[PDB]
Amino acid sequence: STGQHPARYPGAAAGEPTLDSWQEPPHNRWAFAHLGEMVPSAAVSRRPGHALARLGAIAAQLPDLEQRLEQTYTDAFLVLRGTEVVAEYYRAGFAPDDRHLLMSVSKSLCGTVVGALVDEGRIDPAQPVTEYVPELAGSVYDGPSVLQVLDMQISIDYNEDYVDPASEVQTHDRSAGWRTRRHGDPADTYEFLTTLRGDGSTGEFQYCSANTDVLAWIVERVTGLRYVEALSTYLWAKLDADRDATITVDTTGFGFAHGGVSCTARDLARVGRMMLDGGVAPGGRVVSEDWVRRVLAGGSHEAMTDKGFTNTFPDGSYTRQWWCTGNERGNVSGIGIHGQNLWLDPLTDSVIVKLSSWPDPDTEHWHRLQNGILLDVSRALDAV
């Protein structure tokens, strides 16, 4: 009841292959070249133990920076000033070219793909979600505009108490393959999204992962491409990246748009570089100049009532899948749980990538330390 989705390969039936059919023809021609999409898989290294610290450059102004990175469970840290890498850090056991899960920084990448299609005139943010995904009729996404999804200004009954298996947040993970399925669970991410309800009100920010996955669904219906491919075509393939990114997929092959991307720190910085270059990447324009300007400008401040954000950034806001600090520097950031940031410092034409593994997903304690680092590093880049 979720309508047409992009086939896993040319001519594939809906939902095919599954874990139980991938060895059968015609699936197997595709599956034998893509088995990691069906079965958990490990890299077998072609290459035959200590932290790498090349902090520059900023080490003089921040002598204790490495210790501060250790204290916030930093896995990869990179500062791009202009086009130049001016500081790098990677923990022992994590190589410079290793990939790291982005969690909700993935959302900012999804918003970028939507922006690309807006630039092409294939998505109108003023249109209702149901213009593109009619099958969301009868759900909380029946009524709201695409822009309201982009800005996450839709009231949704979405329990964030993860430990409760009944919670929407854990059910979302189970539907998408991030957690073991329970009997009665939705078959895939699309079905889960259709189960969501709300009181109908809009206009106030509510951070909710479902919004990003609806955006990816819209992308698929508009382009006919799997979100996996759209993310490449409209963003990743234009970055001149060192490595492919990866994205977890659910049982239909739908990329887990809201949280499932992994990539290298250096490559993630290329996304920030594109944003600070007015939307243009090495391989071509990604989003319009206007789109970038709107991101840097922020969303409606009055919509933003998340004290977990405004306690630190009183004039903060959220728009188009980016957090906007509204601080004196105009900092904007992608953010994901356990300490992921794609942090933009337009003042110094710099991007800071910090990819981490805090023991906890989201506490005031970790955010205080992490934001202190990002701000101190940003200021260290100012001319003096």
Side-chain angles (χ1 to χ4, degrees), residues 77-111:
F77 171 85
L78 186 147
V79 180
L80 189 74
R81 183 178 64 187
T83 59
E84 176 192 12
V85 178
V86 297
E88 296 185 82
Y89 169 90
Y90 307 92
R91 66 160 166 85
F94 190 94
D97 66 337
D98 279 345
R99 293 189 286 239
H100 193 288
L101 178 59
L102 298 188
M103 291 298 193
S104 290
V105 171
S106 300
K107 295 182 166 59
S108 300
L109 276 47
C110 185

PDB file of all heavy atoms in Angstrom, residues 77-111:
ATOM      1  N   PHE A  77      38.817  13.741  12.987  1.00  0.00           N
ATOM      2  CA  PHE A  77      38.651  15.183  13.107  1.00  0.00           C
ATOM      3  C   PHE A  77      39.449  15.823  11.982  1.00  0.00           C
ATOM      4  O   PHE A  77      40.611  15.476  11.763  1.00  0.00           O
ATOM      5  CB  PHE A  77      39.176  15.647  14.472  1.00  0.00           C
ATOM      6  CG  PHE A  77      39.244  17.143  14.633  1.00  0.00           C
ATOM      7  CD1 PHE A  77      38.126  17.865  15.038  1.00  0.00           C
ATOM      8  CD2 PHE A  77      40.437  17.824  14.413  1.00  0.00           C
ATOM      9  CE1 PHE A  77      38.197  19.247  15.225  1.00  0.00           C
ATOM     10  CE2 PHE A  77      40.520  19.203  14.597  1.00  0.00           C
ATOM     11  CZ  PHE A  77      39.398  19.913  15.005  1.00  0.00           C
ATOM     12  N   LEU A  78      38.830  16.745  11.255  1.00  0.00           N
ATOM     13  CA  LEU A  78      39.514  17.391  10.148  1.00  0.00           C
ATOM     14  C   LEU A  78      39.020  18.814   9.966  1.00  0.00           C
ATOM     15  O   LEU A  78      37.819  19.080  10.034  1.00  0.00           O
ATOM     16  CB  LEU A  78      39.307  16.584   8.858  1.00  0.00           C
ATOM     17  CG  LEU A  78      40.064  17.040   7.607  1.00  0.00           C
ATOM     18  CD1 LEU A  78      40.429  15.827   6.760  1.00  0.00           C
ATOM     19  CD2 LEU A  78      39.211  18.021   6.813  1.00  0.00           C
ATOM     20  N   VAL A  79      39.962  19.724   9.745  1.00  0.00           N
ATOM     21  CA  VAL A  79      39.646  21.123   9.505  1.00  0.00           C
ATOM     22  C   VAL A  79      40.095  21.499   8.104  1.00  0.00           C
ATOM     23  O   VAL A  79      41.272  21.367   7.761  1.00  0.00           O
ATOM     24  CB  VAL A  79      40.358  22.039  10.522  1.00  0.00           C
ATOM     25  CG1 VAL A  79      40.004  23.494  10.251  1.00  0.00           C
ATOM     26  CG2 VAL A  79      39.958  21.650  11.935  1.00  0.00           C
ATOM     27  N   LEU A  80      39.144  21.959   7.298  1.00  0.00           N
ATOM     28  CA  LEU A  80      39.420  22.415   5.949  1.00  0.00           C
ATOM     29  C   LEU A  80      39.248  23.926   5.931  1.00  0.00           C
ATOM     30  O   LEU A  80      38.144  24.434   6.131  1.00  0.00           O
ATOM     31  CB  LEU A  80      38.438  21.770   4.968  1.00  0.00           C
ATOM     32  CG  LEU A  80      38.689  21.970   3.475  1.00  0.00           C
ATOM     33  CD1 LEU A  80      39.862  21.108   3.032  1.00  0.00           C
ATOM     34  CD2 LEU A  80      37.439  21.592   2.699  1.00  0.00           C
ATOM     35  N   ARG A  81      40.346  24.641   5.712  1.00  0.00           N
ATOM     36  CA  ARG A  81      40.305  26.093   5.599  1.00  0.00           C
ATOM     37  C   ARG A  81      40.491  26.438   4.133  1.00  0.00           C
ATOM     38  O   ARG A  81      41.553  26.191   3.562  1.00  0.00           O
ATOM     39  CB  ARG A  81      41.427  26.719   6.432  1.00  0.00           C
ATOM     40  CG  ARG A  81      41.424  28.243   6.430  1.00  0.00           C
ATOM     41  CD  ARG A  81      42.527  28.796   7.321  1.00  0.00           C
ATOM     42  NE  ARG A  81      43.854  28.440   6.829  1.00  0.00           N
ATOM     43  CZ  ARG A  81      44.985  28.674   7.488  1.00  0.00           C
ATOM     44  NH1 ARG A  81      44.953  29.268   8.673  1.00  0.00           N
ATOM     45  NH2 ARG A  81      46.148  28.313   6.963  1.00  0.00           N
ATOM     46  N   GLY A  82      39.454  27.001   3.521  1.00  0.00           N
ATOM     47  CA  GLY A  82      39.459  27.152   2.080  1.00  0.00           C
ATOM     48  C   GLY A  82      39.468  25.781   1.429  1.00  0.00           C
ATOM     49  O   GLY A  82      38.556  24.981   1.646  1.00  0.00           O
ATOM     50  N   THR A  83      40.499  25.501   0.640  1.00  0.00           N
ATOM     51  CA  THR A  83      40.638  24.199  -0.004  1.00  0.00           C
ATOM     52  C   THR A  83      41.715  23.357   0.674  1.00  0.00           C
ATOM     53  O   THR A  83      41.998  22.234   0.249  1.00  0.00           O
ATOM     54  CB  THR A  83      41.000  24.354  -1.493  1.00  0.00           C
ATOM     55  OG1 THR A  83      42.227  25.085  -1.614  1.00  0.00           O
ATOM     56  CG2 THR A  83      39.894  25.095  -2.234  1.00  0.00           C
ATOM     57  N   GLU A  84      42.309  23.903   1.730  1.00  0.00           N
ATOM     58  CA  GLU A  84      43.466  23.288   2.372  1.00  0.00           C
ATOM     59  C   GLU A  84      43.109  22.580   3.677  1.00  0.00           C
ATOM     60  O   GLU A  84      42.450  23.150   4.543  1.00  0.00           O
ATOM     61  CB  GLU A  84      44.528  24.357   2.649  1.00  0.00           C
ATOM     62  CG  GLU A  84      45.751  23.853   3.401  1.00  0.00           C
ATOM     63  CD  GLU A  84      46.637  24.980   3.907  1.00  0.00           C
ATOM     64  OE1 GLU A  84      46.199  26.150   3.873  1.00  0.00           O
ATOM     65  OE2 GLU A  84      47.774  24.696   4.342  1.00  0.00           O
ATOM     66  N   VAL A  85      43.558  21.336   3.816  1.00  0.00           N
ATOM     67  CA  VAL A  85      43.456  20.632   5.088  1.00  0.00           C
ATOM     68  C   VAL A  85      44.521  21.170   6.038  1.00  0.00           C
ATOM     69  O   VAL A  85      45.715  20.970   5.813  1.00  0.00           O
ATOM     70  CB  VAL A  85      43.679  19.118   4.904  1.00  0.00           C
ATOM     71  CG1 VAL A  85      43.609  18.416   6.247  1.00  0.00           C
ATOM     72  CG2 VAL A  85      42.641  18.553   3.946  1.00  0.00           C
ATOM     73  N   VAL A  86      44.091  21.851   7.097  1.00  0.00           N
ATOM     74  CA  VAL A  86      45.031  22.525   7.989  1.00  0.00           C
ATOM     75  C   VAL A  86      45.178  21.860   9.354  1.00  0.00           C
ATOM     76  O   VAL A  86      46.050  22.231  10.141  1.00  0.00           O
ATOM     77  CB  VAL A  86      44.638  24.005   8.197  1.00  0.00           C
ATOM     78  CG1 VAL A  86      44.704  24.744   6.871  1.00  0.00           C
ATOM     79  CG2 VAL A  86      43.242  24.102   8.794  1.00  0.00           C
ATOM     80  N   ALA A  87      44.327  20.880   9.635  1.00  0.00           N
ATOM     81  CA  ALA A  87      44.451  20.086  10.852  1.00  0.00           C
ATOM     82  C   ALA A  87      43.704  18.766  10.705  1.00  0.00           C
ATOM     83  O   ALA A  87      42.614  18.721  10.131  1.00  0.00           O
ATOM     84  CB  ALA A  87      43.911  20.864  12.046  1.00  0.00           C
ATOM     85  N   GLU A  88      44.304  17.696  11.223  1.00  0.00           N
ATOM     86  CA  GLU A  88      43.716  16.361  11.176  1.00  0.00           C
ATOM     87  C   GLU A  88      44.023  15.599  12.455  1.00  0.00           C
ATOM     88  O   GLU A  88      45.100  15.744  13.033  1.00  0.00           O
ATOM     89  CB  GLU A  88      44.285  15.550  10.013  1.00  0.00           C
ATOM     90  CG  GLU A  88      43.993  16.071   8.637  1.00  0.00           C
ATOM     91  CD  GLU A  88      44.494  15.119   7.573  1.00  0.00           C
ATOM     92  OE1 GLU A  88      43.780  14.138   7.280  1.00  0.00           O
ATOM     93  OE2 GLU A  88      45.600  15.345   7.041  1.00  0.00           O
ATOM     94  N   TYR A  89      43.080  14.770  12.880  1.00  0.00           N
ATOM     95  CA  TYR A  89      43.320  13.827  13.959  1.00  0.00           C
ATOM     96  C   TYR A  89      42.503  12.558  13.744  1.00  0.00           C
ATOM     97  O   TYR A  89      41.328  12.619  13.378  1.00  0.00           O
ATOM     98  CB  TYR A  89      42.961  14.456  15.309  1.00  0.00           C
ATOM     99  CG  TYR A  89      42.930  13.461  16.446  1.00  0.00           C
ATOM    100  CD1 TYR A  89      44.075  13.193  17.201  1.00  0.00           C
ATOM    101  CD2 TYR A  89      41.761  12.766  16.753  1.00  0.00           C
ATOM    102  CE1 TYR A  89      44.051  12.255  18.230  1.00  0.00           C
ATOM    103  CE2 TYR A  89      41.726  11.830  17.777  1.00  0.00           C
ATOM    104  CZ  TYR A  89      42.874  11.576  18.514  1.00  0.00           C
ATOM    105  OH  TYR A  89      42.834  10.643  19.525  1.00  0.00           O
ATOM    106  N   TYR A  90      43.132  11.410  13.967  1.00  0.00           N
ATOM    107  CA  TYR A  90      42.433  10.131  13.919  1.00  0.00           C
ATOM    108  C   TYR A  90      42.895   9.283  15.091  1.00  0.00           C
ATOM    109  O   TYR A  90      44.094   9.194  15.361  1.00  0.00           O
ATOM    110  CB  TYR A  90      42.739   9.413  12.603  1.00  0.00           C
ATOM    111  CG  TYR A  90      42.468  10.268  11.390  1.00  0.00           C
ATOM    112  CD1 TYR A  90      43.476  11.047  10.825  1.00  0.00           C
ATOM    113  CD2 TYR A  90      41.189  10.341  10.837  1.00  0.00           C
ATOM    114  CE1 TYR A  90      43.218  11.884   9.742  1.00  0.00           C
ATOM    115  CE2 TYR A  90      40.921  11.173   9.757  1.00  0.00           C
ATOM    116  CZ  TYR A  90      41.935  11.942   9.216  1.00  0.00           C
ATOM    117  OH  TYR A  90      41.666  12.782   8.161  1.00  0.00           O
ATOM    118  N   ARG A  91      41.951   8.667  15.792  1.00  0.00           N
ATOM    119  CA  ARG A  91      42.294   7.874  16.966  1.00  0.00           C
ATOM    120  C   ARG A  91      43.098   6.650  16.559  1.00  0.00           C
ATOM    121  O   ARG A  91      43.107   6.257  15.392  1.00  0.00           O
ATOM    122  CB  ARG A  91      41.032   7.428  17.704  1.00  0.00           C
ATOM    123  CG  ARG A  91      40.151   6.453  16.929  1.00  0.00           C
ATOM    124  CD  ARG A  91      39.217   5.708  17.875  1.00  0.00           C
ATOM    125  NE  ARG A  91      38.147   5.004  17.175  1.00  0.00           N
ATOM    126  CZ  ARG A  91      38.267   3.788  16.652  1.00  0.00           C
ATOM    127  NH1 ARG A  91      39.417   3.132  16.744  1.00  0.00           N
ATOM    128  NH2 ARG A  91      37.233   3.221  16.043  1.00  0.00           N
ATOM    129  N   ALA A  92      43.780   6.048  17.525  1.00  0.00           N
ATOM    130  CA  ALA A  92      44.429   4.766  17.290  1.00  0.00           C
ATOM    131  C   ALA A  92      43.381   3.778  16.790  1.00  0.00           C
ATOM    132  O   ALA A  92      42.306   3.652  17.377  1.00  0.00           O
ATOM    133  CB  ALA A  92      45.060   4.257  18.583  1.00  0.00           C
ATOM    134  N   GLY A  93      43.689   3.084  15.700  1.00  0.00           N
ATOM    135  CA  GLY A  93      42.784   2.065  15.201  1.00  0.00           C
ATOM    136  C   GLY A  93      41.829   2.556  14.130  1.00  0.00           C
ATOM    137  O   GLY A  93      41.076   1.766  13.559  1.00  0.00           O
ATOM    138  N   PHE A  94      41.854   3.858  13.858  1.00  0.00           N
ATOM    139  CA  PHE A  94      41.032   4.434  12.798  1.00  0.00           C
ATOM    140  C   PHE A  94      41.934   5.129  11.789  1.00  0.00           C
ATOM    141  O   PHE A  94      42.599   6.115  12.111  1.00  0.00           O
ATOM    142  CB  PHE A  94      40.034   5.438  13.385  1.00  0.00           C
ATOM    143  CG  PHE A  94      38.988   5.906  12.403  1.00  0.00           C
ATOM    144  CD1 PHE A  94      37.750   5.275  12.336  1.00  0.00           C
ATOM    145  CD2 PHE A  94      39.247   6.968  11.539  1.00  0.00           C
ATOM    146  CE1 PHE A  94      36.779   5.693  11.420  1.00  0.00           C
ATOM    147  CE2 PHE A  94      38.280   7.394  10.614  1.00  0.00           C
ATOM    148  CZ  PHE A  94      37.049   6.752  10.562  1.00  0.00           C
ATOM    149  N   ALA A  95      41.959   4.610  10.566  1.00  0.00           N
ATOM    150  CA  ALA A  95      42.822   5.154   9.530  1.00  0.00           C
ATOM    151  C   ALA A  95      42.194   6.392   8.901  1.00  0.00           C
ATOM    152  O   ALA A  95      40.972   6.545   8.900  1.00  0.00           O
ATOM    153  CB  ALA A  95      43.086   4.098   8.461  1.00  0.00           C
ATOM    154  N   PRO A  96      43.029   7.295   8.362  1.00  0.00           N
ATOM    155  CA  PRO A  96      42.548   8.528   7.727  1.00  0.00           C
ATOM    156  C   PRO A  96      41.504   8.269   6.642  1.00  0.00           C
ATOM    157  O   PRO A  96      40.601   9.083   6.432  1.00  0.00           O
ATOM    158  CB  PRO A  96      43.820   9.161   7.164  1.00  0.00           C
ATOM    159  CG  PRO A  96      44.912   8.623   8.037  1.00  0.00           C
ATOM    160  CD  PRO A  96      44.501   7.217   8.357  1.00  0.00           C
ATOM    161  N   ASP A  97      41.628   7.134   5.961  1.00  0.00           N
ATOM    162  CA  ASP A  97      40.725   6.803   4.865  1.00  0.00           C
ATOM    163  C   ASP A  97      39.633   5.813   5.267  1.00  0.00           C
ATOM    164  O   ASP A  97      38.908   5.308   4.412  1.00  0.00           O
ATOM    165  CB  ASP A  97      41.519   6.250   3.674  1.00  0.00           C
ATOM    166  CG  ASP A  97      42.186   4.917   3.974  1.00  0.00           C
ATOM    167  OD1 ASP A  97      42.430   4.610   5.160  1.00  0.00           O
ATOM    168  OD2 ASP A  97      42.471   4.171   3.014  1.00  0.00           O
ATOM    169  N   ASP A  98      39.515   5.532   6.561  1.00  0.00           N
ATOM    170  CA  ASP A  98      38.418   4.704   7.051  1.00  0.00           C
ATOM    171  C   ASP A  98      37.116   5.496   7.022  1.00  0.00           C
ATOM    172  O   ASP A  98      37.119   6.727   7.138  1.00  0.00           O
ATOM    173  CB  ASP A  98      38.690   4.223   8.483  1.00  0.00           C
ATOM    174  CG  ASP A  98      39.609   3.013   8.533  1.00  0.00           C
ATOM    175  OD1 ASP A  98      39.816   2.373   7.480  1.00  0.00           O
ATOM    176  OD2 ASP A  98      40.116   2.702   9.632  1.00  0.00           O
ATOM    177  N   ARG A  99      36.004   4.788   6.861  1.00  0.00           N
ATOM    178  CA  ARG A  99      34.698   5.431   6.841  1.00  0.00           C
ATOM    179  C   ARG A  99      34.045   5.354   8.211  1.00  0.00           C
ATOM    180  O   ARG A  99      34.309   4.436   8.988  1.00  0.00           O
ATOM    181  CB  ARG A  99      33.807   4.783   5.776  1.00  0.00           C
ATOM    182  CG  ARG A  99      34.307   5.049   4.355  1.00  0.00           C
ATOM    183  CD  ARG A  99      33.314   4.597   3.293  1.00  0.00           C
ATOM    184  NE  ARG A  99      33.297   3.146   3.162  1.00  0.00           N
ATOM    185  CZ  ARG A  99      33.560   2.484   2.039  1.00  0.00           C
ATOM    186  NH1 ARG A  99      33.865   3.137   0.925  1.00  0.00           N
ATOM    187  NH2 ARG A  99      33.528   1.160   2.038  1.00  0.00           N
ATOM    188  N   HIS A 100      33.205   6.342   8.507  1.00  0.00           N
ATOM    189  CA  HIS A 100      32.569   6.470   9.814  1.00  0.00           C
ATOM    190  C   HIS A 100      31.084   6.774   9.623  1.00  0.00           C
ATOM    191  O   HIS A 100      30.707   7.592   8.780  1.00  0.00           O
ATOM    192  CB  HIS A 100      33.236   7.611  10.598  1.00  0.00           C
ATOM    193  CG  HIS A 100      32.892   7.647  12.058  1.00  0.00           C
ATOM    194  ND1 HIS A 100      31.656   8.034  12.533  1.00  0.00           N
ATOM    195  CD2 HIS A 100      33.654   7.406  13.152  1.00  0.00           C
ATOM    196  CE1 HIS A 100      31.673   8.034  13.855  1.00  0.00           C
ATOM    197  NE2 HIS A 100      32.875   7.657  14.254  1.00  0.00           N
ATOM    198  N   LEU A 101      30.248   6.116  10.413  1.00  0.00           N
ATOM    199  CA  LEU A 101      28.814   6.372  10.409  1.00  0.00           C
ATOM    200  C   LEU A 101      28.519   7.839  10.729  1.00  0.00           C
ATOM    201  O   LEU A 101      29.134   8.433  11.626  1.00  0.00           O
ATOM    202  CB  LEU A 101      28.136   5.463  11.433  1.00  0.00           C
ATOM    203  CG  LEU A 101      26.625   5.593  11.619  1.00  0.00           C
ATOM    204  CD1 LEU A 101      25.897   5.310  10.305  1.00  0.00           C
ATOM    205  CD2 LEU A 101      26.181   4.618  12.699  1.00  0.00           C
ATOM    206  N   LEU A 102      27.573   8.415   9.994  1.00  0.00           N
ATOM    207  CA  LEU A 102      27.263   9.834  10.133  1.00  0.00           C
ATOM    208  C   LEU A 102      26.074  10.097  11.044  1.00  0.00           C
ATOM    209  O   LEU A 102      25.857  11.234  11.460  1.00  0.00           O
ATOM    210  CB  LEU A 102      26.996  10.455   8.760  1.00  0.00           C
ATOM    211  CG  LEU A 102      28.157  10.428   7.759  1.00  0.00           C
ATOM    212  CD1 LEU A 102      27.764  11.260   6.550  1.00  0.00           C
ATOM    213  CD2 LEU A 102      29.435  10.973   8.397  1.00  0.00           C
ATOM    214  N   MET A 103      25.302   9.061  11.352  1.00  0.00           N
ATOM    215  CA  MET A 103      24.039   9.248  12.054  1.00  0.00           C
ATOM    216  C   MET A 103      23.278  10.383  11.363  1.00  0.00           C
ATOM    217  O   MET A 103      23.257  10.435  10.136  1.00  0.00           O
ATOM    218  CB  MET A 103      24.303   9.546  13.537  1.00  0.00           C
ATOM    219  CG  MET A 103      24.868   8.348  14.305  1.00  0.00           C
ATOM    220  SD  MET A 103      23.720   6.947  14.316  1.00  0.00           S
ATOM    221  CE  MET A 103      24.447   5.882  15.582  1.00  0.00           C
ATOM    222  N   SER A 104      22.670  11.296  12.114  1.00  0.00           N
ATOM    223  CA  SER A 104      21.799  12.288  11.489  1.00  0.00           C
ATOM    224  C   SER A 104      22.495  13.386  10.683  1.00  0.00           C
ATOM    225  O   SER A 104      21.821  14.221  10.083  1.00  0.00           O
ATOM    226  CB  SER A 104      20.880  12.921  12.533  1.00  0.00           C
ATOM    227  OG  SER A 104      19.919  11.979  12.984  1.00  0.00           O
ATOM    228  N   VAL A 105      23.825  13.394  10.636  1.00  0.00           N
ATOM    229  CA  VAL A 105      24.478  14.225   9.634  1.00  0.00           C
ATOM    230  C   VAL A 105      24.014  13.763   8.247  1.00  0.00           C
ATOM    231  O   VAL A 105      23.996  14.544   7.298  1.00  0.00           O
ATOM    232  CB  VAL A 105      26.024  14.156   9.746  1.00  0.00           C
ATOM    233  CG1 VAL A 105      26.670  14.856   8.557  1.00  0.00           C
ATOM    234  CG2 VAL A 105      26.474  14.833  11.045  1.00  0.00           C
ATOM    235  N   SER A 106      23.607  12.495   8.151  1.00  0.00           N
ATOM    236  CA  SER A 106      23.015  11.958   6.920  1.00  0.00           C
ATOM    237  C   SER A 106      21.838  12.806   6.440  1.00  0.00           C
ATOM    238  O   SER A 106      21.599  12.926   5.238  1.00  0.00           O
ATOM    239  CB  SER A 106      22.517  10.521   7.139  1.00  0.00           C
ATOM    240  OG  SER A 106      23.565   9.653   7.535  1.00  0.00           O
ATOM    241  N   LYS A 107      21.100  13.389   7.381  1.00  0.00           N
ATOM    242  CA  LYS A 107      19.925  14.191   7.036  1.00  0.00           C
ATOM    243  C   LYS A 107      20.318  15.396   6.193  1.00  0.00           C
ATOM    244  O   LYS A 107      19.603  15.775   5.264  1.00  0.00           O
ATOM    245  CB  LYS A 107      19.216  14.682   8.305  1.00  0.00           C
ATOM    246  CG  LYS A 107      18.618  13.590   9.179  1.00  0.00           C
ATOM    247  CD  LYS A 107      17.910  14.219  10.382  1.00  0.00           C
ATOM    248  CE  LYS A 107      17.012  13.216  11.091  1.00  0.00           C
ATOM    249  NZ  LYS A 107      17.767  12.028  11.575  1.00  0.00           N
ATOM    250  N   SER A 108      21.451  16.007   6.519  1.00  0.00           N
ATOM    251  CA  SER A 108      21.897  17.179   5.775  1.00  0.00           C
ATOM    252  C   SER A 108      22.254  16.822   4.340  1.00  0.00           C
ATOM    253  O   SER A 108      22.066  17.628   3.425  1.00  0.00           O
ATOM    254  CB  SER A 108      23.091  17.825   6.481  1.00  0.00           C
ATOM    255  OG  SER A 108      22.722  18.233   7.789  1.00  0.00           O
ATOM    256  N   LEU A 109      22.762  15.610   4.137  1.00  0.00           N
ATOM    257  CA  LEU A 109      23.031  15.119   2.790  1.00  0.00           C
ATOM    258  C   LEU A 109      21.726  14.895   2.021  1.00  0.00           C
ATOM    259  O   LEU A 109      21.623  15.239   0.838  1.00  0.00           O
ATOM    260  CB  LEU A 109      23.839  13.817   2.860  1.00  0.00           C
ATOM    261  CG  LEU A 109      25.363  13.929   3.008  1.00  0.00           C
ATOM    262  CD1 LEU A 109      25.747  14.930   4.082  1.00  0.00           C
ATOM    263  CD2 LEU A 109      25.922  12.554   3.332  1.00  0.00           C
ATOM    264  N   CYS A 110      20.725  14.340   2.693  1.00  0.00           N
ATOM    265  CA  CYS A 110      19.426  14.138   2.061  1.00  0.00           C
ATOM    266  C   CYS A 110      18.796  15.471   1.665  1.00  0.00           C
ATOM    267  O   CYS A 110      18.289  15.620   0.556  1.00  0.00           O
ATOM    268  CB  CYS A 110      18.486  13.389   3.003  1.00  0.00           C
ATOM    269  SG  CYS A 110      16.900  12.983   2.235  1.00  0.00           S
ATOM    270  N   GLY A 111      18.832  16.442   2.573  1.00  0.00           N
ATOM    271  CA  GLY A 111      18.303  17.756   2.248  1.00  0.00           C
ATOM    272  C   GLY A 111      18.985  18.360   1.032  1.00  0.00           C
ATOM    273  O   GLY A 111      18.366  19.085   0.248  1.00  0.00           O
TER     274      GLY A 111
END
